[PDB]
Design a protein around this motif. Structure first.
Motif, short mmCIF file in Angstrom:
data_model
loop_
_atom_site.label_atom_id
_atom_site.label_comp_id
_atom_site.label_asym_id
_atom_site.label_seq_id
_atom_site.Cartn_x
_atom_site.Cartn_y
_atom_site.Cartn_z
N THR A 1 0.81 -1.21 0.00
CA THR A 1 0.00 0.00 0.00
C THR A 1 0.85 1.27 0.00
OG1 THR A 1 -0.37 -0.44 2.36
CG2 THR A 1 -2.16 -0.97 0.83
N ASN A 2 2.15 1.12 -0.25
CA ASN A 2 3.02 2.25 -0.56
C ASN A 2 3.28 2.34 -2.06
OD1 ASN A 2 3.19 3.08 2.06
ND2 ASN A 2 5.35 2.58 2.36
N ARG A 3 2.75 1.38 -2.82
CA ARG A 3 2.90 1.39 -4.27
C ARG A 3 1.77 2.22 -4.89
NH1 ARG A 3 6.65 -0.82 -2.11
NH2 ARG A 3 8.05 -2.35 -3.07
N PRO A 4 2.07 2.90 -6.01
CA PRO A 4 1.00 3.45 -6.84
C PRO A 4 -0.11 2.42 -7.05
CG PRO A 4 3.10 4.07 -7.76
CD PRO A 4 3.40 3.27 -6.51
N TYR A 5 -1.33 2.91 -7.21
CA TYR A 5 -2.53 2.09 -7.35
C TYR A 5 -2.99 1.37 -6.08
CZ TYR A 5 -6.07 -1.17 -8.79
OH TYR A 5 -7.23 -1.91 -8.87
N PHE A 6 -2.10 0.60 -5.46
CA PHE A 6 -2.47 -0.08 -4.22
C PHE A 6 -2.64 0.92 -3.08
CE2 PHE A 6 -0.44 -3.65 -6.59
CZ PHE A 6 -1.53 -4.50 -6.62
N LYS A 7 -1.91 2.03 -3.16
CA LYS A 7 -2.07 3.14 -2.23
C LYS A 7 -3.50 3.67 -2.26
CE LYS A 7 -0.91 6.77 0.33
NZ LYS A 7 -0.53 6.64 1.77
N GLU A 8 -4.07 3.78 -3.46
CA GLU A 8 -5.44 4.25 -3.63
C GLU A 8 -6.45 3.13 -3.43
OE1 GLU A 8 -2.93 5.27 -5.24
OE2 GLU A 8 -3.03 7.46 -4.96
N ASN A 9 -6.03 1.89 -3.68
CA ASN A 9 -6.94 0.75 -3.67
C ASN A 9 -6.52 -0.40 -2.75
OD1 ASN A 9 -8.82 1.40 -6.32
ND2 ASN A 9 -6.72 2.15 -6.53
N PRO A 10 -6.44 -0.12 -1.44
CA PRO A 10 -5.91 -1.03 -0.42
C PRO A 10 -6.49 -2.44 -0.47
CG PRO A 10 -6.47 1.07 0.55
CD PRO A 10 -6.98 1.11 -0.85
N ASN A 11 -7.79 -2.56 -0.69
CA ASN A 11 -8.41 -3.89 -0.78
C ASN A 11 -7.86 -4.75 -1.90
OD1 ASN A 11 -11.62 -2.81 0.50
ND2 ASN A 11 -9.98 -3.96 1.53
N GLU A 12 -7.43 -4.11 -2.98
CA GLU A 12 -6.81 -4.81 -4.10
C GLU A 12 -5.55 -5.54 -3.66
OE1 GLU A 12 -7.95 -5.21 -7.13
OE2 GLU A 12 -9.78 -4.15 -6.53
N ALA A 13 -4.89 -4.98 -2.65
CA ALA A 13 -3.69 -5.58 -2.08
C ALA A 13 -4.10 -6.64 -1.06
CB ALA A 13 -2.81 -4.52 -1.42
N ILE A 14 -4.92 -6.24 -0.10
CA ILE A 14 -5.38 -7.15 0.94
C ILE A 14 -5.93 -8.46 0.39
CG2 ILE A 14 -7.10 -7.55 2.73
CD1 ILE A 14 -6.92 -4.71 3.57
N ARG A 15 -6.82 -8.33 -0.60
CA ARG A 15 -7.50 -9.48 -1.20
C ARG A 15 -6.52 -10.41 -1.91
NH1 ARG A 15 -11.54 -7.28 -2.58
NH2 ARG A 15 -10.90 -6.08 -4.41
N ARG A 16 -5.64 -9.85 -2.72
CA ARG A 16 -4.61 -10.66 -3.37
C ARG A 16 -3.71 -11.37 -2.36
NH1 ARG A 16 -5.80 -6.90 -7.19
NH2 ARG A 16 -5.95 -7.80 -9.30
N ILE A 17 -3.20 -10.63 -1.37
CA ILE A 17 -2.31 -11.23 -0.37
C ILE A 17 -3.04 -12.33 0.42
CG2 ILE A 17 -0.89 -10.85 1.69
CD1 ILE A 17 -0.64 -7.85 0.60
N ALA A 18 -4.20 -11.99 0.96
CA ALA A 18 -5.00 -12.89 1.79
C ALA A 18 -5.34 -14.21 1.11
CB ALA A 18 -6.28 -12.19 2.27
N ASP A 19 -5.45 -14.18 -0.21
CA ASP A 19 -5.71 -15.39 -0.98
C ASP A 19 -4.67 -16.48 -0.77
OD1 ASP A 19 -7.49 -16.51 -3.32
OD2 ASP A 19 -8.01 -14.37 -3.11
N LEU A 20 -3.48 -16.10 -0.30
CA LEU A 20 -2.42 -17.09 -0.06
C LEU A 20 -2.30 -17.44 1.42
CD1 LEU A 20 -1.97 -15.93 -2.92
CD2 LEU A 20 0.50 -15.99 -2.50
N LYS A 21 -3.33 -17.13 2.19
CA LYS A 21 -3.27 -17.33 3.64
C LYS A 21 -3.14 -18.80 4.04
CE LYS A 21 -8.32 -16.94 4.25
NZ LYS A 21 -8.68 -16.55 2.86
N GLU A 22 -3.52 -19.70 3.15
CA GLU A 22 -3.39 -21.12 3.42
C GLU A 22 -2.35 -21.78 2.51
OE1 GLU A 22 -8.12 -21.17 4.48
OE2 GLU A 22 -7.30 -22.95 3.48
N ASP A 23 -1.32 -21.01 2.15
CA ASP A 23 -0.25 -21.52 1.30
C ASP A 23 0.53 -22.64 1.97
OD1 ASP A 23 2.51 -21.48 -0.24
OD2 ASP A 23 1.15 -20.27 -1.46
N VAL A 24 0.83 -23.67 1.18
CA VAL A 24 1.58 -24.84 1.64
C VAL A 24 2.99 -24.49 2.10
CG1 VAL A 24 2.66 -26.98 0.86
CG2 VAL A 24 0.29 -26.48 0.25
N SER A 25 3.56 -23.44 1.52
CA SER A 25 4.93 -23.03 1.84
C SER A 25 4.95 -22.04 3.02
CB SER A 25 5.59 -22.39 0.61
OG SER A 25 6.91 -21.98 0.90
N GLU A 26 5.70 -22.38 4.06
CA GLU A 26 5.88 -21.47 5.19
C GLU A 26 6.60 -20.21 4.72
OE1 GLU A 26 8.39 -22.72 8.50
OE2 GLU A 26 7.17 -21.49 9.86
#
Length: 201
Positions: free
Chosen positions: A129-154
């Protein structure tokens, strides 16, 4: 003599220095030439030289063949420091083409089967959320990141947790809202949850 230059790099580096040389070399020569140099240097057994090469890839990443090589081959690198540079180079690509326009490639990397490809995207954009676009659109970051919340890789999961943690510091409410929907039913999502919720009520 390109082979000579590489051998020289192996000697000099075996002792930001790699990044600065890469930037200088990139700025000082035509792209066609530097691409050949980058692949040659990426074959070095000296991890510092591969770091240098991966910075070069970042600067050259408008070439999709270079970007693909980063996605699929650099992601196989055995050296953890080289992996850090992969994340920086991926950030460099997104900055070169603009964050909003890089969305399709961000999504593709995040869903790749190589766990290192996934981490490089997650980690490289921090703080998202310090990047252009994600700064204006925080959920776009949250949603993408959160999608990997159950990733097999620690390795990936730590990145995910911290990326959400970064965001929580500036968008506490958005992060709380996203976390509220999580069912902590596995060791994976719990690891991510602990990292991401430090600063949320």
């Amino acid at each position: 003599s390109m082979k000579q230059y590489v051998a020289r790099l192996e000697k000099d580096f075996s002792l930001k220095e790699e990044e600065q040389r890469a930037l200088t070399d990139y700025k000082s020569n035509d792209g066609e030439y530097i691409k050949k140099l980058a692949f040659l240097a990426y074959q070095s057994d000296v991890y510092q030289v591969r770091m240098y090469a991966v910075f070069l890839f970042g600067y050259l990443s408008k070439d999709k063949e270079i970007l693909i090589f980063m996605r699929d081959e650099v992601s196989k690198d055995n050296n953890w420091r080289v992996q850090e540079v992969l994340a920086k180079a991926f950030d460099e690509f997104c900055k070169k083409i603009e964050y909003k326009k890089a969305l399709p490639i961000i999504d593709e990397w995040l869903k790749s089967s190589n766990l290192h490809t996934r981490r490089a995207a997650t980690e490289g954009l921090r703080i998202w959320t310090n990047r252009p676009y994600f700064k204006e659109n925080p959920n776009e970051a949250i949603r993408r990141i959160a999608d990997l919340k159950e990733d097999v890789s620690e390795y990936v999961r730590k990145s995910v947790g911290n990326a959400l943690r970064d965001i929580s510091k500036k968008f506490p409410d958005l992060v709380k809202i996203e976390l509220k929907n999580w069912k902590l039913e596995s060791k994976e999502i719990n690891q991510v949850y602990k990292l991401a919720s430090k600063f949320i009520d």
